[PDB]
């Protein structure tokens, strides 16, 4: 309930956004300024500070070329730029620790999958929520891998 | 301005002409004004090339708003009364001179029957929705001239191709006689413009394919 | 556009034509005006036709509103109340030419007498109710003959079958007289829309139904 | 109230709708608005009511008037100059709400190619004519959706018969579309009336030959 | 609508659109606005189809009477001050809203130097006039257009072939940019009209001459 | 008062009059109007002398605040929202009589092709935005008859010197028919304003440079 | 529509009429405008129907909610002013034609003498109130009619049946003149209604001992 | 009443007539209108004596407001902008009548060049300032006859003495064609008022050295 | 989070009193004074105080 | 109604006459119109009754509440502001007919010459206020009557009591030759009111003094 209540107020904010500029001014590390600026007040302002740990994720645009950016917005407001991966809730160092070593720059979706998933294991199929920010499509790049195509990945 | 959409088997197609006029002076000649406003929808507004592309712009975010809030995508009567919000919201701008009449053309995804699941919605001065049941629609200065075109041209709807060919058609009897509604530009190159949406989406038709079917009708008419 | 309803025997049946006019222009053929806004009632909504659909789609929120948060549903004194209110709440926007006066058609459950439990209940532009005790009523450019045309055939009105006839009938007679009224078109099959009430609620009467009752009439009436 | 006319080879059919409206209620079923105003001439009147019997009786007073006295008849021009005078006449009535614009169809005893000798003027507020070379034409508040349908139609003219029909297609397409221009009455047996000229002068068509072509197009369209 | 009026070496030549409207409507598309009034003289009206033909057959009556009364023609700024008085008379009927501006194109018999005996004069509201010394005129909707077109072309004009080509070109920069005046219509085969005035008279341009032209100045600007 | 803007291989330039009038009387002969809004925008208003400079330098302070929030520049389609929402925002003051209508002129330092980065948007009355594909546009008292000589003149524009001689000849035409905007003062030294924009930025063209062009204009014409 | 009341001794009596008008249009032949609103004490109102539905409905609610909150009812001269008080405040509303005037009958619990306890109030337009000393009063568009039937008929009134002859004779003589009161109807049965106030309350008169009365009205004038 | 402003070598003067007006009738001689609003400015407002005074007297206490908050001067940019304020403040109240148009005269003592520091900036009724490149400038109801004087007398400026010299004519030549300007009253003694400001400050320029001006300008043109 | 709000609130009120008067008036003396005053009043009247320490610098 | 003022040496007087009028007709006899606001000042008010007399009444509470709250009065200058804000107040209101302009009359004890220390301010409908160094003013139907005879007079005012009398006769002047003044009565023994203020303070000169001056007034006329 806590960060869903952030997920549509960020949706909000980026939408207000680029209707107020254009759809090519919003980026992750705004939206991930928000964020913290939001988990900031909320942890000094609100009786019980919010529980949860976001991510926030920016692909570059269709034809362009720039590295992907990741961000790591935690309880109080911490803002942490990360170049690789982030790991977020649970036992974070086994599955932290799995992936500094099994680790592949520029690996496909289907090695990276694999390689995410057993940190995931670490830690503790359709018990699996996976989705990719595809930098090959038009203009959305959140596209969603469900069910049999999920299966087919593995 | 004139703006027309019509229902063939399997999809909807929506087309409108290029022309924006200040009086009797020709403001423009490469405006568009009809815009595919999400996967399934496509909108055409008889108006200014801003107010088309404002009015266009507002309601594509306001559905891709909803899709990414609540995972999916609003039912196609979820999408004519958020429409319909949006036009009655511009009534009090209404009454100074600033009246924009939607025209609305759609797939609906969860319809029964894959063969008339192509949808076509016009909006009244007061917000007020109908959708057509007749098979084809216009708006602008030139609809009437465009619906009495379709109604002896629809008869040979049987597809895509025909559909968009009669939609075409009844673009070009709208220009011939409104003076405020651009026919077929062969020297400068400018033709109408064209969405199709089937089970597949929407889709832009390309100007070349318009193109071919303008000079057909032109030949077809000497 | 013209909307009839009249009692029968044990209910209610309401029903309206299809046609919508810009002037002398016909600008529609396939409105409708009639809906279902709960179990047991609907509405007829003449002129500003396109809104038709969101005045039946507000009252019916309202009037289901009431029925989930109290556990009950409101009394037809009270379904008339709201629906007067919501009449009231719309003079302001009346005086510029938006006016829209519904007619309310429905079936009384806590009536004593069952027969006699049909309801039909008339608004004027300043929100002002009047429950039909002659047994017909009706709204709209056409309702003059309209209502000319149910005195003379209300006497033959016994069961919900012979009630629908009669109201198709008096459409009909109205599209007659007045052109901004449409009649059964046999060209197209669009035929007027219909509602009947009884003690099991509220039904749209099909197409199938009107257009038999339609053709029986203009057929005949022609060389047919 | 609608008024279409149009040429054939070898002459020019006259048809007009019955019907008579005040505001939104009919007022009338059974109006004449077409009549033979001289030998090889008719004029129908898109007026307020029934203007037009007195109107077309003082036009043919006029040129019969001319033909005793002279012992020839007036000329084509001569026969429009006197009709457009008529009009003008009339221009200070048209401000208070009473309009009456005449259509003007005959057939030219006296041109070169018999063929194409029919006639067709139209006059606008100012008494102002104009021939018309394309064919066809229309008065009343039915006529653009009359010409549109004749603009789709006229190609299938060919002979007096294929003439009259086109005529009484365009008169049911104006009624279809407008609510003040009356269609065929199957019920009453009323039926637009209608007149064609050619060679052998101004004949009123029986309502019989306009029932049965009435009945075609509503067979053809169901 | 457009009236454009240009002098040449040895004459002048008057042109004009055949387009009428009515609101947005397209009216009429084989409009005559320019006739020849007399020997020397042609005259180019731009409002309705008939308010072109009833000014011209007025004016060339009254020219025509005064040459067989006195049994010579008006001297040419008489006929000016016949055209000033007959506009002048119109006044009251102008503020209704029966505007009717004439443009005046002739040749001076009894000028001087035969290479400048071209006349151009305008006239305004009130009935006043003015004889132009710029080489160039235009009246009607699409008139700055095409003044603004003759002013950057007037130079090419060395003849009466460069004079009418100049004209035509103007009038379709005109069409261009008015909707209310008509461009060359290929499809239907008709194009502006024109009257060449020189020592010899007045004369109708041929419609395949000013066709020739404008599908020259069509296949230049593609 | 008369601003103008074309587009040249390259970039922009946007050029505009130094006139002010309170009805006949002229008011102001040093006005400025154009002004250099961010390092790739000008912005040119049409409306009241004053208004021009307030109108810009919020702008100016808008695109510039954005700049130093965010860290970027706005996209240029930012920059165009921006203008199109503060025009929008002075709806309700243009009823009275305050109607002030921005030209912009840009250089897209992120658009693909170089050549064609350059960029001209347009707003009418009620906010609404279009982006010229023509080549060309003005605005103001004298902007036909500038767009009508720019139309004539465009295929001459090649570089940024023959693009901006264009943009003041444009201007000359519009002083020579249109009293409100004022051709180049030879007696005070006064000349149009006009700016460059191309990949390296918006520079103002210096006053002595115009001067030339005008100069040349002048004796080219003489 | 009419409505009258009058003392009798030891009580009051109030009456009124059944039709309803949209002009000339009979629009309700059963409308009841004579209300119980407590237990001693009724109202009846003409003008609008839609403010008189709504008046007598929200006064006994206001009547009794103060009776229910304080344990006993308001004093005659509180139910007065609380009546007073609702009419002013449907004044602005009043100025566009939703005129409601109304009329009040009461039985003073707390008066002296019983025998004169019976109150009539009227009301105009203002708000303002007044006790009626004379015995009678009347409102609606036939008041006068029945005010002058009455000041003939009073000295008969001796009891509550007297004064319920003489409330439906006036109420009859005002149906008599004037058109927009409704009479008695025979062949449908439908009477004017009327409440009976006295020592035991308010009561509404039984519709079969007005008919009787109607009868003896009617014989007694044939 | 008039005021006017004029640029010398190394300075500015300004002046005003002591005028005020009721119609027709002289309501005030001895009216002031010029004030030094701070240290290197001065206010001249064409209108009454105190809406004159209460404009200058805001504007002079805003200007020391920020001085001291800041504790440094506005820039002259600052000082325009502060005063474009101020009139844009009052523009609901000009519509009424209650129209105050201001002139502005200073020093900008961070100007690069002494010489030409001078300012003269004027204001319109919407609150647009322009500063003028041309030398002089006035407002009132006078000042298009003083303009007219300063064109032919401006180049007699090369001084303070010179340039205060021209400034009275001005208003006297002000006087001599407008009634609502005051000319130099003998009789009484009464002098328009100046001020005069270059590097070392704004000072009142004294009534006798006006005086022995006005004397030299009247005995100058008898 | 704490000091990219006090950089946009300096920005707001930069952009609006160069608007309002000049640009030749906004100072960098002006802006850490408002820093100063806003400072101030987080301390005192905030939940929790800023963890900040600004500077604000001027150039010729 | 008429309201004067003058100055004399060591002072100021103030007089105003005792009419009322309602249209024509002579409502009162016995106004008063000057009232003593404080120590020093004295104001009379013309316009409305119903506004004026109020309005020294406000006056008096806005100079005392100051007095009180700060422990010294007013300057006279804060006086007149004070003043003038009141009236400014009061513009909404005038435009409808409520008008009320004051005249205010005072001794500024801090003045550097006590002979000249007398004050006179007039204001106009704005809330503009003038001090008149004339010496002399009034305010009223009948000013300008009282104003003329005041400039005959003024110079044989030496002291108060010849001061005084002139203002009875300028007040007898403006009865003379104005209906809605009223002169002295002897047969009610009714006299203008009159206000003497020096450095002894603000006293009400008595009723017999002024009864003496009018008896003189009269005699000498007579």
Redesign the interface.
Known sequence: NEFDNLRRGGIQFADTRGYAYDRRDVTGRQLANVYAQTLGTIFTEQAKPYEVELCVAEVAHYGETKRPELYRITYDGSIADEPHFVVMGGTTEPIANALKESYAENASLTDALRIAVAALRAGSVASLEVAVLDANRPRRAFRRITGSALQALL | XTIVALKYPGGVVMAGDR???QG???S????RKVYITDDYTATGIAG????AV?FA??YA?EL??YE??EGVPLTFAGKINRL?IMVRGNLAAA??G?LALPLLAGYDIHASDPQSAGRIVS??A?????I???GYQAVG??S??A???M???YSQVTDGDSGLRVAVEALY?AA?????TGGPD???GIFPTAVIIDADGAVDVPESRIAELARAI?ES??
């Open positions: 022309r924006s006029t009797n002076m020709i423009g000649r490469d405006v200014t090339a801003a107010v404002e712009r507002l975010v891709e708003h990414k809030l319909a009454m100074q600033l909006f009244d007061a917000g007020g929705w109908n057509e049941e007749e200065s030139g009437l001239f619906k009495s075109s109604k002896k041209l009897d011939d006689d409104d003076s405020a062969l020297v400068r032109i008419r000497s």
